[PDB]
Write a protein that binds this ligand. Structure first.
Ligand SMILES: [Cu+2]
Ligand SMILES: [Cu+2]
Ligand SMILES: [Cu+2]
Lengths: 97, 388, 388, 388
């Protein structure tokens, strides 16, 4: 559920910047234009690990596939970090440092 | 600011910046100015720096003191990464709208991929006005106009802050109802079942149901408000169009070819004497008028009688000295070029002796009696002369 | 089958398939047919897809319903991976022998490396006969002929099945001699030495000796039967030879150059209106007759008066509409091209609004009064018009 | 030594070595000789071997029996890695000074990056004298001359050996003062505090202070002795200049083009019969005089009436046989070329049947009546004829 609910609860604050605009010749989102207009010296466009398309992408399954993958990996990460937190809660007293 | 700290040989042998202009040195808020220029890619591109196959044109300002409305490189509007080919010239232009009042040093730069950033000439721009008067009007596909400075922030707050308040209320409710020391003591004595009962589980279930309902309602209302949205647009652009005007490096029958036979630079002096074999494949005698560096200009005072409009910290109007004999057409001549300016030391081009490759690079410009300019690429190893 | 689900902009901007033929639409078992075609590599190759430096020509069938006796791409027999260069044309041919009766959709495809597969036009082929009548005759270097369908399978069975029987006998022998519950109880009470004795170890040693002897004997007999064998042949082939016939993209003085000034596509409509700047570098007036897509064809009914022999699901014989004025030689003209067909929607080219790059690509064909064809590459960004 | 063990198809299809010379076959100690040659990069570069983009020219000797004073490849002095382009010719030269007396096989080689080393022809060189008489004079930037054989070793010893003595003294001091068995027994009984006291800690502190002082003093004295030093110089060199003389592969209107229509090689015979389609784009009739291999030469005895000065183990002065009819200018002719020599078997080029790519490659040289030489590149698949 934690993996699945990430995108639906972020959409209300995200969709407004996903409206389409037409620049000189290209099509842009409002988010891309916000990033372009307000200049970051050390943030070129090529750095962002965003999706760019694949020949194995299918009929509008991107967000659900990402959500399910995130949930499945979150299962294992939760299982590991529960015991990590249990270890960090140790009351063991050692004798020599 | 920041280029001086970069190695001299990497600055000289990656990108040679030439004619660079700032349309306005003083702008108001909401006033536009254009920073244009040209760049040459050095043929002997360093192995340390990655290929310019993936690169991004950028404005080197201390922040969004100017808003970039558009930028063009290689005859193409370039909001994303482009490709620069080795040994070719590309013209660039950037439109900037004044946002924050003050004096700022704004540079031309190109961020190549895992090699990194290359910084060009900069100029001081004075922006006068109030940042509160700044507007960033943007037209959508439906014809509606928004202010990019202020658009969409209220929605972000109205979605984010109430959920933080809800989480704080959840934590506070459980903390006040149960406590920490009391709950710890109850759990420690085997009475952990006394902390949580049926009513607590019912309250949690009701809270989760309300949270899920709120999430679904918010998603549906958001989709109703914005029925048509598109994903983020990303990707490398199509190959660029290089400069093909007469006089640039790599053009037709009339040109100049310069080869570096040898050079010596003083350590820690300000001088650099080089030997240049020049072949003149034009129809008119030429005089060497300029040597181009990482963004520095060393001009021949016999050719550049009046200094041009360039930033003072990069303009050496008397930095280049050669013989006063023009190179006749079709004549191969060996000449001795002396570069002498304090700007060679201030810009830390004299730190070549600290690098792992003691080489120079740049562009040489030759001029005709009628003022036609021919560019050639010079580069190669140099020898440090240690002096005390 | 499967291309519709692929992104429109990647299909349009990777490989442009043109004249593609199927020599026979109905074949018998053991009957050969040839699927030929030509492909153009889009100059603005997407960054998402890897370079076509490593690629493999393939037949998109639902299985070995047809047996590929040979295939040729770039004037070379191509059983292994080849190299395709950006912006070049390559002709391909595939020979297929009927194996399984039925109706099958057989496509031309090219699998590029870590970009992936690109699927071209397909056609329905009817194979009539019995699969039991299929033969795959192959001649060896010694002149002996084998049936590739049936060769070598008996040896595989005769080596694999007896060893599985031996392993099952080993497990069954130990299970019956010792058991599981009894052995567990014996080991659990410290009597693990009662389970295994000297006779058991002797039996194991004899079995291992016999197994080693059988392996050595089998290896020796196999080497005697086949004294001369070669390793598997693998590796990239030599560079291919592109098409250099008159009228293709990238050929001599007479050609057409088309640049996309701008385009609009309806969402979720079936239309696409584009603006094309056309430069005619031929000696005769030309009329635009076809626009080429991911495998779709949008034909001008004024040029293509009679529809050609193409698969129905990709042929829009009335999909292209332009002005009826020929473009005079040496004349640069801006024209408005309308693409309108339900096939644009069925093939999910209208899903361009879902992609992260709203661009089109393909080939435009221009025709002379005498029917000579000139190809040009068109591509660039387009704007979605949202309608309800 | 070592090339025979390398696969034949990789040796043939990577680098084709031609005219290679050794200025002296017998040198004294401190006597210089020049090993020169030319190399061709095969157009169909194998996928197994990495690109020659990063490569280093080297001398294949059994050690520093000869000292390399200089080496040049592609018209450039090449102490570091260079770049070789596919399908181009590069001339190389290496200067070697005699160091160790004896007979040594010295080869031309090029180490390409993660593909690996490619070994060219070698020759036996006799070095006469005493290694104690060897000198390696080197001039510094300050004009001082040093002997590179002996320079700087005394400083290395004087810094390294005393510190090893100090460490040994430290270990010995603690071992004698405390011991191992006694210290173990003391620690084991809870008396670990008896082993180390205040005086021991004071001694350790004094030793550490003295060590730090010695390190600082050594650093300061070293900086005083050598006030001006530079970092190690590394990096890829600028692009090389290929050979552009008449007659080499890839030059102007007059040339030869050879295509391999088919070839057969005996297994385990010494023969190789190939079919060559030859197009003569020169103005004079040509006769095929030589086939070039991984470093082997198969000469036509009708063209090479007298054998040249080449190493005996690579020179087949009678290995090539063809028809005695010259190929007229502008004439396309199919010829049958027979290669027959025991050197084909000794150099393990007959092991082509063990490779995963049964292909040949190399250079064919054609000669005019006046002796002008034209080179063409031949290569392609061959068929093994298994014989008993
Ligand atoms: Cu600055
Ligand atoms: Cu299909
Ligand atoms: Cu050897």
């Amino acid at each position: 559920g934690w993996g699945l609910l990430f995108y639906p609860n972020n959409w209300p604050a995200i969709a407004a910047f996903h409206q389409a605009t037409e620049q000189h010749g290209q099509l842009m989102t409002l988010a891309d234009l916000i990033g372009f207009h307000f200049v970051r010296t050390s943030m070129p466009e090529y750095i962002r690990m965003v999706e760019r398309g694949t020949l194995r992408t299918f009929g509008k399954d991107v967000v659900p596939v990402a959500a399910f993958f995130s949930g499945f990996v979150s299962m294992m990460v939760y299982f590991l970090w529960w015991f990590m937190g249990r270890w960090y809660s140790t009351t063991k007293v050692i004798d020599t440092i | 600011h920041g280029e001086k700290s970069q190695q001299a040989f990497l600055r000289m042998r990656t990108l040679n910046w030439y004619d660079v202009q700032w349309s306005k040195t003083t702008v108001n808020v909401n006033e536009e100015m254009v920073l244009s220029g040209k760049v040459h890619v050095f043929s002997a591109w360093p192995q340390a720096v990655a290929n310019p196959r993936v690169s991004f044109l950028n404005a080197g300002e201390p922040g969004p003191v100017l808003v970039r409305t558009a930028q063009f490189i290689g005859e193409q509007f370039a909001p994303r990464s482009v490709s620069l080919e080795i040994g070719k010239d590309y013209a660039f232009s950037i439109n900037l709208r004044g946002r924050r009042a003050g004096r700022w040093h704004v540079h031309a730069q190109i961020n190549v991929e895992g090699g990194g950033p290359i910084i060009g000439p900069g100029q001081w721009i004075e922006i006068k006005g109030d940042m509160k008067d700044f507007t960033d009007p943007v037209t959508l596909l439906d014809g509606s106009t928004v202010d990019l400075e202020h658009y969409g922030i209220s929605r972000v707050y109205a979605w984010h802050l109430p959920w933080m308040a809800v989480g704080a209320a959840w934590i506070f409710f459980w903390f006040v109802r149960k406590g920490i020391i009391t709950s710890y003591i109850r759990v420690a004595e085997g009475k952990a079942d006394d902390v949580i009962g049926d009513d607590d589980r019912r309250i949690g279930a009701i809270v989760l149901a309300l949270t899920i309902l709120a999430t679904i309602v918010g998603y549906a209302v958001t989709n109703s408000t914005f029925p048509r949205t598109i994903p983020l647009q990303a990707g490398l652009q199509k190959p660029l169009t290089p400069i093909e005007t007469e006089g640039t490096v790599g053009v037709g029958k009339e040109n100049v070819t310069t080869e570096l036979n040898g050079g010596v630079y003083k350590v820690p002096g300000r001088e650099l004497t080089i030997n240049v074999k020049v072949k003149n494949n034009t129809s008119q005698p030429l005089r060497l008028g300029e040597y181009t560096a990482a963004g520095l200009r060393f001009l021949n005072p016999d050719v550049f009688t009046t200094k041009p409009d360039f930033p003072d910290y990069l303009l050496a109007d008397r930095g280049l000295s050669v013989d006063a004999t023009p190179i006749a057409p079709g004549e191969a001549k060996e000449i001795v070029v002396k570069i002498q300016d304090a700007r060679w030391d201030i810009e830390r081009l004299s730190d070549l002796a600290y690098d792992t490759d003691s080489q120079i690079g740049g562009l040489l410009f030759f001029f005709s009696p009628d003022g036609k300019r021919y560019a050639s690429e010079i580069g190669g190893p140099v020898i440090p002369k240690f002096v005390a």
